[PDB]
Amino acid sequence: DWCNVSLVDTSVPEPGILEHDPFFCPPTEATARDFLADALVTLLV
Amino acid sequence: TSITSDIGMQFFDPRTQNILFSTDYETHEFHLPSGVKSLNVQKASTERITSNATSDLNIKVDGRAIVRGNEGVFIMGKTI
Numbered sequence A: 001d002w003c004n005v006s007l008v009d010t011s012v013p014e015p016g017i018l019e020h021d022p023f024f025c026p027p028t029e030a031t032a033r034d035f036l037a038d039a040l041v042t043l044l045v
Numbered sequence B: 001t002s003i004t005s006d007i008g009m010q011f012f013d014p015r016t017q018n019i020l021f022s023t024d025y026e027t028h029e030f031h032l033p034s035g036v037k038s039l040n041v042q043k044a045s046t047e048r049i050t051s052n053a054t055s056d057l058n059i060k061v062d063g064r065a066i067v068r069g070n071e072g073v074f075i076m077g078k079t080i
């Protein structure tokens, strides 16, 4: 059938990260103190 | 670990922004997962049922078996 003869040639058909930033959540930094020496002073006076 | 809403569960990996799993079925089409042993679906459109080359198919059912051939049935076998 010559009517459905198809010819095709070459053509030019030419058509991940994860991150979220919150603002802050710092813990108790510099965790050290004492309430004896000052108590000793104010109970030694 | 129950959940409840009008739409339902969701999950998408942020490194692809593709919904890897959802439960609003009308929107996203369900696909068959991998590693499935059995599946019990209430209606099947099967072109062909076949076994592998070792063991026997067993169309076993506690209920009744109604096989109906609209253009006819052909049983081919050695010992029938």
Ligand SMILES: *[C@@H]1O[C@H](CO)[C@@H](O[C@@H]2O[C@H](CO)[C@@H](O[C@@H]3O[C@H](CO)[C@@H](O)[C@H](O)[C@@H]3O)[C@H](O)[C@H]2NC(C)=O)[C@H](O)[C@H]1NC(C)=O
Pocket: B052, B053, B054, B055
């Ligand atoms: C072809 O089909 C036959 C029939 O199902 C397959 O034989 C069966 O295969 C399953 C899964 O591989 C076996 O189940 C498991 O077997 C192990 C030991 O074989 C057992 O310890 C487990 O508890 C579990 O039952 C099943 O035993 C086995 N049956 C027989 C009679 O061989 C076969 O593997 C299939 N082959 C291919 C290439 O698909």
Ligand SMILES: *[C@@H]1O[C@H](CO)[C@@H](O)[C@H](O)[C@H]1NC(C)=O
Pocket: A003, A004
């Ligand atoms: C190509 O074949 C189809 C199917 O038979 C037919 O409908 C169509 O008219 C044919 N095309 C031509 C140009 O004849």
